[PDB]
């Protein structure tokens, strides 16, 4: 139990879910969450959090401490009809955000509505920087609803990456630690009946003379009946994406977190711009790139630095060198540089 | 790496065991000694290790079936350690976790089946461990021969496996898709709204941590309460908000083409009456206004038939065909020097909506407010009556206007006879003889045996 | 030990056990989803969104006029109920027809076209000839008339499908009885005097405008077209009273607002300017203009509590409509009333 | 050497009774309205029909009836001069 949990068996917080009815206690509880939206997205509009957040459609969840102090909260608009719900704002105060209360928000949310009404699905626009806490709370980027159900209900964010998560039908959110582990009990529980690791076997009959000589592990009994193949054995030594998955991951993720690549987060749309394509033989995007690399079709590190200087090639010759667009693919470039230099293997890839 | 795994090597090779069988040394002066199954075969020993009186243990990698036959316990191991790093729901990272290519849906499918959706509750599968049915049905051997036969067909699909398409520009709501500027139908929003500068007043409000009530007093202290007048304002602008775009979704003004097209059709007086009219639109519903505008174009049109109707008696103008062709030719002279309401009222036809009270008998207003055959006489072509040919046409009966048509016969020179064959008849009771009747006519026989046949069908004589 | 699963919920149950439901420890009590609009259609938008849009300064000019302030101005459209005289009158027949009229403006009288069966303008209302000279080829021929009211008599007649029974003319006394021999223009005064004596036809003044054509064929519609316009102008008369009732409150709630108004705004600006310095206790202004506009509000709203003052009635709800019968029959017999109360005078 | 007259208040007095004091008024104000000439045919029968509509046809006969009196009346003395009392 993290500290969050015991805090709220012991009373220390609560939560409290309040809109706008025009009562006392709802309206502190909504300016708290206001100016709490307000300090952690500084980019928005204060007037548009402001019509936001104290609309009377859109819910809010809070965690309030004992001398009525909010320390974060999630806003959302429930569509009932078609079994959706978008979630509008999301944030936690940064000087108490090291105790870890957003994993027992999110869990609450999710209770509440998954007991409160039938919804399934949410749809969000992720910060730039909540991305890894979105993915950890089981959302994933990949959206599997129908482009109907969520097109002219939702609403667009610039700067915003679109996100889906599917509720589990029938569950509690709340005791997934407790639930889990007794599943995970079991599971090792079964294994052990049966895992033979616990019979201390003599030495090799072989080796009890005291010469040491290749044994087939097929031959032994044990070892035999355990199933060991040698295919098997070569096989399960092979990751399932490439051995620079991991590094290129972390690459991937610090561009992408780099406000400098804003610009070639998504592909240009051919109806905006028809000369895009009849300039650009070869259009590049790091979604492109992203979808390639999962397809493994890039054998060698060579081809990543090659479609990331196309990139750049292909922005700035779209746009003109002294427009911002060929300036900032310049700079984002300086930028993938650098992070290739902090790497020792890729340094000497550089051309003079 | 994010991973909070523990990566096990082995202390000869230097070579990752933890997904493979491998074989580890028991004895005490051995500690965390691992010895791959190669290293255990070649026995190559390094450090303590003694592989001539040491015994060791074998660490199987636990394949085989336990819940699901095409899952074994080190998936089902990995799908849950996952769970508990990846978080249950986050299927991408759980799926490449687990291996053996089985992409997020068959994952998501195996996980729901096996432990959320099933005949069984948190306790897993039927009733305990005693049952081993399933991992004695099928030998470990054909179990590692599929598995491996389907890895390699996996791969080499992937190898051959087409190239992923390049995502497309995410698909954007763009809620402006009604066809005008600035409205979202499916949050029944503007994007300006009444007063949008009514947050321009409460946009930097700001509380004061656990404040509520007076320590002393049992009040809101005046900073409260100050605070809290200036809420009910931006309450009540919302509610105005709301009613206007109550009043405007009724009505249908979010119709710019159609309600321009019907104001161009109409003509002038029509269309100031209409401008006059609007305003009023906000204390009713939709028929009821368009009742009221529907009563205001009738009364003008009625208004403008009479007059025209007036005009035309003035002329000597006896006929409404006439007067259309004195209507033709004034306006080929004025030149000279669809049809309207008022050119469908005054038509030779009237509509039928204007054959009956508006407002019946007992004043309550309606709700929808806004024969003898004689023969063709042998050697007769009848011809046809015109205003300008009879005089008298408007009185005779229907009944006797085919009759003249069929007899060939104006209606004056048949008002006589009627005149006098009822003369003759009265005279004498009312009986009369077929040949007094023949000779009163004075005609061709056949006419006047037909007519004398006609008057008595009708009753006005009887036959001797 | 603890439930692994969430319980649903039932009607009418428990805070507490909400709670327990809901884990949250709080929930609104009013979900506020009756101030809703109305639920999304619940359509696909997907469908390629027009390329054209019209610009909101457009539409919103467009939908001004539907919102301004109601204004003694408009008060006397309704309250006005136009022109009541000339519509309702029956000219006759003119004398000089439209050709000759429209001659008299150059030499174009030249030509006579007058009828050679409408000499004196009057081809019918003439007798002529008697049954002597009736002939098949003049039966084709309007030589031979019977006048008039004879005509007019005659025709009154209906056919069915006898009725020259008279009572005491079936005896041989009345059988031996002559007649004299008398002519149309004498025929039409007897019948005329006959129709006097029953009761049908007016007493002589104390001591017939046959030449009018007041039967024409244009004087039929123009008779129904007079009927349906004072028809008419009674119900706009009935509407336009009911519209005047409701303007009047709606006027004195304008009136009322537009003072509340200037307070609320009034004491909006005077708390923006301690946040603006930042500061201190309250002033002045800002404790009294509270109570002043608190006692505005709970003591002259009071009158205004009625919920329809501001609310536009929807088709949705059913018979809401203001023109219900059971009101617009008294206000259709006082409009009647006015009506003649005006004639009277006029 | 004039025949006398004929007697009319009984072929009137069953006309009365037959069409009914209600719809009397209507019946009497058409009539000689159209005998004066404001009317024609078509509004003298859409306004009449109605009124001497019968299954035993005892209305239209009586019509008739009174109209051949007063036609065939034309020939006989002149009455006295007045309204008739009977009426």
Known sequence: ?352 | ?464 | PTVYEIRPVLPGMSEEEIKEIYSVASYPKSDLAHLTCGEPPDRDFSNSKPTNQINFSTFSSYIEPYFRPFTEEDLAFLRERGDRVTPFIMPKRGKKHYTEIWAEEDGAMAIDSSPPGGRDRLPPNQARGSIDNMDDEVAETDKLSVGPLLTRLLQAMRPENPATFMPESNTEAWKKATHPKLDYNQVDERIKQELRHIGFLPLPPSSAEYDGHYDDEVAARLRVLQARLREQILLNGARKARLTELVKERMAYQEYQTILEDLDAQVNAAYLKRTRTMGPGIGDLARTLMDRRRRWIEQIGAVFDDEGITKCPRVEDGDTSIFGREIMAELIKREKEAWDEEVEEE | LVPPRIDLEPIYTALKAAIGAEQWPVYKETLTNFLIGRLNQAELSERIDPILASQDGQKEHLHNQLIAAIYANVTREMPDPGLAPWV
């Open chain 1, 1 to 352: 139990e993290k500290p969050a949990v015991i805090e709220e068996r012991n009373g220390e917080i609560e939560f409290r879910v309040v809109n706008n009815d025009g009562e006392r206690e709802s309206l502190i509880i909504l300016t708290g969450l206001k100016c709490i939206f307000q300090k952690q997205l500084p980019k928005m509009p204060k007037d548009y959090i402001a019509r936001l957040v104290y609309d009377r459609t859109h819910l809010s969840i809070a965690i309030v401490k004992k001398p009525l102090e909010v320390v974060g909260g999630i806003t959302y608009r429930p569509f009932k009809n078609r079994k959706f719900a978008e979630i509008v704002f999301c944030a936690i105060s940064s000087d108490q955000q090291v105790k870890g209360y957003g994993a027992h928000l999110m869990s609450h949310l999710k209770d509440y509505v998954k007991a409160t009404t039938n919804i399934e699905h949410f749809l969000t626009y992720a910060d730039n920087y909540a991305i890894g806490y979105f993915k950890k709370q089981g959302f994933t980027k990949e959206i599997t609803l129908d482009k109907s159900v969520w097109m002219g209900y939702i609403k667009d964010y610039e700067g915003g990456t679109i996100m889906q998560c599917t509720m589990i039908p029938r569950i509690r959110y709340l005791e997934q630690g407790r639930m889990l582990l007794k599943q995970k009990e079991c599971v090792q529980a079964k294994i052990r009946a049966f895992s033979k690791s616990h019979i201390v076997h003599p030495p090799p009959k072989q080796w009890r003379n005291g010469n040491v000589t290749p044994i087939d592990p097929l031959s032994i009994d044990a070892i035999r009946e355990s199933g060991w193949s040698p295919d098997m054995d070569e096989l399960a030594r092979q990751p399932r994406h490439g051995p620079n998955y991991n590094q290129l991951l972390h690459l991937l993720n610090d561009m992408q977190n780099h406000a400098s690549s804003w610009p070639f987060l998504v592909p240009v749309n051919k109806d905006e711009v028809v000369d895009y394509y009849d300039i650009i033989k070869e259009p590049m995007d790091l979604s492109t790139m992203e979808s390639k690399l999962e397809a493994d079709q890039y054998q060698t590190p060579e081809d990543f630095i090659r479609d990331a200087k196309l990139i750049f090639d292909n922005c700035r010759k779209y746009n003109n060198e002294n427009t911002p667009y060929a300036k900032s693919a310049n700079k984002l470039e300086k930028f993938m540089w650098q992070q290739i230099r902090q790497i020792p293997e890729w340094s000497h890839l550089e051309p003079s």
């Open chain 2, 1 to 464: 790496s994010g991973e909070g795994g523990v990566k096990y090597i082995c202390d000869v090779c230097s070579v990752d065991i933890t997904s493979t069988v491998r074989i580890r040394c028991a004895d005490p002066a051995c500690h965390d000694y691992d010895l791959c199954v190669p290293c255990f075969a070649n026995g190559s020993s390094s450090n303590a290790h003694k592989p001539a009186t040491h015994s060791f243990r074998v660490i199987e990698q636990n394949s085989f079936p336990i819940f699901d036959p095409d899952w074994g316990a080190d998936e089902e191991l990995l799908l849950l350690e996952g769970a508990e790093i990846y978080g249950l729901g986050s299927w991408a990272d759980i799926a490449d976790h687990i291996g053996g290519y089985r992409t997020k849906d068959e994952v998501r499918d195996h996980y729901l089946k096996v432990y959320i959706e099933s005949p069984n509750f948190p306790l897993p599968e039927r009733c305990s461990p005693y049952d081993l049915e399933l991992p004695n049905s099928i030998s470990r051997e054909e179990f590692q021969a599929r598995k491996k036969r389907r890895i390699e067909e996996r791969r080499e699909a992937a190898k051959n496996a087409p190239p992923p398409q390049p995502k497309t520009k995410p698909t954007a709501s763009i809620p402006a898709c009604h066809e005008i500027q600035g409205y979202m139908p499916g949050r029944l929003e503007f994007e300006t709204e009444y007063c949008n500068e009514a947050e321009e007043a409460v946009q930097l409000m700001s509380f004061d941590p656990g404040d509520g009530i007076n320590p002393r007093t049992g009040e809101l202290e005046p900073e409260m309460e100050l605070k809290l007048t200036v809420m009910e304002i931006y309450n009540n602008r919302l509610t105005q908000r709301v009613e206007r775009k109550k009043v405007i979704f009724e009505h249908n003004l979010l119709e710019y083409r159609e309600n321009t097209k019907a104001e161009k059709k109409r003509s002038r007086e029509e269309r100031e009456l209409l401008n006059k009219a609007k305003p009023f639109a906000r204390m009713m519903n939709r028929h009821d206004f368009e009742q009221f505008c529907q009563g205001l174009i009738d009364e003008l049109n009625l208004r403008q038939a009479i007059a025209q109707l007036q005009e035309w008696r003035s002329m000597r103008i006896g006929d409404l065909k006439s007067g259309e062709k004195y209507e033709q030719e004034k306006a080929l002279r004025i030149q000279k020097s669809p049809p309207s309401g008022a050119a469908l009222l005054v038509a030779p036809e009237l509509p039928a909506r204007y054959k009956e009270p508006i407002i019946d008998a007992n004043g309550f207003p309606r709700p929808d407010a806004n024969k003898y055959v004689p023969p063709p006489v042998p050697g007769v072509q009848p011809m046809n009556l015109t205003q300008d040919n009879a005089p008298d046409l408007h009185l005779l009966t229907p009944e006797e206007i085919k009759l003249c048509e069929t007899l060939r016969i104006q209606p004056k020179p048949y008002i006589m006879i009627k005149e006098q064959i009822l003369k003759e008849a009265v005279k004498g009771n009312g009986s009369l003889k077929k040949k007094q009747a023949k000779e009163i006519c004075r005609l061709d026989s056949q006419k006047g045996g037909r007519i004398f046949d006609f008057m008595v069908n009708a009753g006005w004589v009887v036959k001797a």
